Design a protein around this ligand. Structure first.
Ligand SMILES: Cc1ncc(C[n+]2csc(CCOP(=O)(O)OP(=O)(O)O)c2C)c(N)n1
Ligand SMILES: Cc1ncc(C[n+]2csc(CCOP(=O)(O)OP(=O)(O)O)c2C)c(N)n1
Ligand SMILES: O=C[C@H](O)[C@H](O)COP(=O)(O)O
Ligand SMILES: O=C[C@H](O)[C@H](O)COP(=O)(O)O
Ligand SMILES: [Ca+2]
Ligand SMILES: [Ca+2]
Lengths: 650, 650
């Protein structure tokens, strides 16, 4: 009972830090932290190997709070176990510049593994964390040298399990046999609209059995013994595990078992009452020294990390090439990259050119993982050399995501968050729409996921409007911290991949054609590193045709038609708005000199082009089911129309 | 043995019309139509009640080809049953201007119910088709008077069942008990990447049994007797049913059971071999007259619809007032609406004002269905007077979608496609990312779904950057056939609802604040009907501040601040770019006079604003976890910054 009272005292410390931080914020989510405090205690005190002195210890267990809104459950337990998150920060919950924002932000807060809040993201991203551990183990572990051994734990809510992304990621996690992925579902029967049976009465655990997961239940979150056994059962199981954990939202309070406990402060009366009923004499933010001493993990984590650093030293003597590769990949250091593009002798789609860049890049990047959402032949994403990942071939660097763009987004982000890997995945640009939240989350975390988007335009032909992008380019360019690179040709494509791989600040979208487009010169194309450049200049420019991707070739043809009539325009290739806007003002004015009229050409939405052009040849309607180039021409992409657009400015 | 031969011969007409249409186009998807010919035969010939002569018959059975790549399956059987789809349109498969586009397009081919091609969308929209049939049947059917009674049939591929959206919608269909939804799954063990066990080994029917669906297998699609059984088992059952129908892709060709049969024409060799292995003598696009007269459905069609018209006259006699409302609703005629907004006395959030407009609007609109993806308390989407739809209360006008924004999108599209309902659903603007493909699909189809989006900016405060939109406005505005209306205040908000309810051509997104903003003059706010308008003019203006939603109030504060320094600017309110652009040039140039410098203010990305302003006060970064107004102010939305930006032009 001194063990039980210290457990109870410690669990309540978690409960009241959350209650009071929400109370003093007058904003946040107290209900779920109150019910799940016992699971937070058990993971951070007993189950997880982690180190509060070094959150980036590569061999730590990873905890993902997919149920983001319960941020204070995570802040309380980080604080209590000795992570560098002072009490003053928990008193600054949801305040400007605090390390305790409303939802967990990876990079903002020590020990936060994934930016959560958008439901389905945490639990889906966690599939990549665990795929990354499995594969890295397969690559590096040897007899008597186990340098990769950690689990991926997740706390998810009713919301997480309703989002279709979580089901897609569960299908793949089970298909892949990720034995070391352990998800806790807070089964507390309450959602924002009230009781879950308003909207959610499926047999959740039967669904997860069908995906090939183990399911377990724990009838009371407060029964630590029942949590301990379930966890041991999950680790013995070769399958990913879903542990349904029954809890009371607002546990211990007069808002217990109510949706009123979910998303607003308890109120002074209800905080007081919770204190009565849980036997908590301590005032706001005060926790006794007993609990600090019991919860301190600074020493157990020094011991754990030190034990791992020492196994690395034995690894480094027994296998020094393997050791230098792991250390290089864990630090995210790229090896030297080719300076010379592949050799192209004829017209080729930028998809096929992208395939050729990957044939050159993959054999020198064992970290580079690739895949597609069931478009491998159409996307050119399986490099020469790569084999399929499966349970039977855990060394395969090529991922068959199936028709699951969103969870592919989430799993790429997780593969890229883990350490050891750089991951890219493919689909048609139109189907970026199915993964938007995973794209935004990568830009928010600053995770450099590479999203490959082929079939960039109406030029794709007969598949027609449901497949032909229009708004997509401008919709992705408006997103903060996403480079959007639309190479004009096979050569630009090679430089686009160098830009993507070297860019670590956030994601890159590479935008590629289905149809064949001519070659530029490799020396001219290199200009892509500046995001925009003068491709074909002239004596005393009367104007500029500015263009992206396939439309640069339209522009060059319009340059000729105009030159024949004594009008002289230069052609600028703007493969990336973002990399161009990062250039010195002096370089941007050399390229697009003020006072010169400019026409933009791009087979997408006009909205945005006025930033650079006076007139745009663009597409502000949906496409059509017809062959290329007919579809392209009849929808107004001819060199005659670009020419006429330029003549209307002079 | 000679009905067995008319079946085989009809089934093969479907097969060969598809094969030859793909082979002549030299583009498209022959495999699935080959495998699934038998089911298309059975549905159009025997099972479905439909009228080739009136595809708009309100009480027809609805068929949704979710696996829209198999378009030649639908085009073949529509032709053979005497829909207005000539042999010449089959010969123009995927050619410019044809009635046979690569993927099925609602409103472009007689008898096509839903624009499909983006996998997940068909099977998901079908839940809205069924919910509409079920609700309208409950609202209008009377003892002796069955005026609503049809089934919603769906054909879905592997791809449809891997997409998270199809899971969300199956969860909701099972929860609602949509007895008359029947889904056939082409369980053909092939996908584009190769065998389905590359990425898809879940027990699909166990998952659907966990959603509370009935599941059935047909071991062979050619066994029409098996198919007849399954479909009768489905209709007897009160659950939605999924019928796994095993088929060989490329049935009868040397490309049978190969991914090579999926998405390319067979070629001559395999076309020629396939006529042999199935013994099909008739040359390309020749069907024997024996098959046209067997399959001709006009007679049976006319009789089914005459029966229903008779039941309607009987209904008009027995229930005059109900009949009048039903006819008005099926035709999508609006009844008269209030022309003056609710009365407002205090600063209020446009989410709350939206709530107050719906309290006013809904009692006059029995066709109006409301809902939220588990944010009913935060979206103000439950009108006073609405009750929860459930299996037990089918007359409820309010839909709890749970955390299923994507499936909500699809289901609102289904509701609004079916006839008799106008359906809207709410979530936070940031979560439009989860439902994008269904927003896009509304815009492609011209289906006037109304998407309610609250928490439109960093102004929402503490919930932080994962909840705060940035890119979303311009990302939506870029999409063709989408009105994006960001009303400035309580009064603008009422006129936005009028615009959205009166817009029939396509979807509308209403964008609302969490935080309260002041009231404008009721009579001024009427300007919203023109997209943009002068809110506060001045004498001989030296410039314009143009703004949308909340930032209108920021622009008036900056107007006043500029007057204090002897600088006069006019404030324009641009609640909708698309309604402004639709105004005559002369009105546009009245509102924004050429030559006058223009500073724009919007708490979202800059990209696009160059279309109207010379400077923009915008947000081109993610948000922060902090309270309003502080978070709004420190991220640069103050009257001092807007004024500063104007004076940097003057
Ligand atoms: C994708 C997404 N859609 C909507 C929301 C808005 N939202 C915040 S919390 C929540 C539901 C939370 O309910 P549950 O997951 O059961 O939480 P608990 O009862 O465990 O506190 C919703 C709809 C969100 N965070 N993410
Ligand atoms: C959302 C979405 N992602 C990707 C595609 C591209 N695509 C077309 S069909 C298909 C999958 C083909 O497999 P399945 O759906 O089982 O079709 P079948 O082999 O039966 O023809 C893919 C990836 C799509 N149409 N929609
Ligand atoms: O839609 C699915 C098809 O497999 C895909 O569209 C094939 O197209 P491709 O010839 O453009 O690779
Ligand atoms: O948990 C969910 C959100 O924090 C909540 O819905 C926001 O509530 P509000 O309506 O006060 O913005
Ligand atoms: Ca819950
Ligand atoms: Ca298939």
């Amino acid at each position: 009972k001194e063990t039980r009272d210290l457990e109870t005292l410690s669990v309540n410390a978690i409960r009241f830090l959350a209650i009071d931080a929400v109370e003093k914020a007058r904003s946040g989510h107290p209900g779920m932290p109150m019910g799940m405090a016992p699971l937070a205690y058990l993971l951070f005190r007993e189950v997880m190997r982690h180190n509060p002195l070094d959150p980036d210890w590569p061999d730590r267990d990873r905890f993902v709070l997919s149920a983001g809104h319960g941020s204070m459950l995570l802040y309380a337990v980080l604080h209590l176990t000795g992570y560098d998150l002072p009490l003053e920060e928990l008193k600054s919950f949801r305040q400007w510049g605090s390390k305790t924002p409303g939802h967990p932000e990876r990079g903002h807060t020590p020990g936060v593994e994934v930016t959560t809040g958008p439901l389905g993201q945490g639990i889906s991203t966690a599939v990549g964390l665990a795929l990354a551990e499995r594969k890295l183990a397969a690559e590096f572990n040897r007899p008597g040298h186990v340098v990769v051994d950690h689990y991926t734990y997740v706390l998810a809510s009713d919301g997480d399990l309703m989002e279709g992304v979580s089901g897609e990621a569960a299908s793949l996690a089970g298909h892949w046999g990720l034995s070391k992925l352990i998800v806790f579902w807070d089964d507390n029967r309450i959602s924002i609209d009230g009781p879950t049976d308003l909207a959610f009465t499926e047999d959740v655990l039967a669904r997860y059995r069908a995906y090939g997961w183990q399911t377990l239940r724990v009838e009371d979150v407060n029964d630590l013994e029942a949590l301990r056994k379930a966890i041991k059962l999950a680790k013995l199981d070769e399958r990913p595990t879903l542990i349904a954990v029954r809890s009371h939202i607002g546990f211990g309070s007069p808002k217990q078992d109510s949706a009123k406990a979910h998303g607003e402060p308890l109120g002074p009366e209800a905080v007081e009452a919770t204190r009565r009923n849980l036997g908590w004499p301590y005032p706001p933010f005060v926790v006794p020294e007993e609990v600090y001493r019991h919860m301190d993990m600074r020493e157990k984590g020094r011991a754990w990390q030190e034990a791992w650093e020492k196994a690395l030293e034995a690894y480094a003597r027994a296998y020094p090439d393997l050791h230098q590769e792991l250390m290089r990949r864990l630090r995210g250091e790229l090896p030297p990259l080719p300076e010379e593009p592949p050799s192209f002798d004829k017209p080729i789609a930028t998809r096929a050119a992208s395939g050729r860049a990957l044939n050159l890049l993959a054999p020198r990047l064992p970290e580079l993982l690739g895949g597609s959402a069931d478009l491998t032949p159409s996307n050119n994403t399986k490099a020469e050399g790569m084999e399929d990942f499966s349970r039977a071939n855990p060394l395969g660097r090529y991922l068959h995501f199936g028709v699951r763009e969103h969870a592919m987004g989430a799993i790429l982000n997780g593969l890229n968050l883990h350490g050891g890997y750089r991951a890219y995945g493919g689909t048609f640009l139109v189907f970026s729409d199915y993964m938007r939240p995973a794209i935004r989350l990568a830009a928010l975390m600053g995770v450099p996921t590479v999203f490959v988007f082929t079939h960039d335009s109406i030029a794709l032909g007969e598949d027609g409007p449901t497949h032909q992008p229009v708004e997509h380019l401008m919709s992705l360019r408006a997103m903060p911290n996403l480079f959007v690179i639309r190479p004009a040709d096979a050569y630009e494509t090679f430089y686009a991949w160098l830009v993507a791989l070297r860019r670590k600040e956030g994601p890159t979208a590479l935008v590629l054609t289905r149809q064949a487009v001519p070659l530029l010169s490799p020396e001219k194309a290199r200009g892509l590193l500046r995001g925009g450049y003068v491709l074909e200049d002239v004596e005393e420019p009367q104007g500029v045709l500015v263009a992206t991707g396939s439309e640069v070739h339209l522009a060059l043809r319009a340059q000729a038609l105009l030159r024949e009539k004594g009008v002289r325009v230069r052609v600028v290739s703007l493969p990336s708005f973002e990399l161009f806007a990062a250039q010195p003002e002096a370089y941007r004015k050399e390229v697009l000199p003020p006072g010169l009229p400019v026409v933009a050409v791009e087979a997408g939405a006009s909205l945005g082009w006025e930033r650079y052009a006076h007139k745009v040849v663009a597409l502000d309607r949906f496409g059509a089911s017809a062959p290329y180039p007919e579809v392209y021409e009849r929808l107004g992409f001819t060199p005659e129309r670009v020419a006429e657009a330029f003549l209307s400015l002079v």
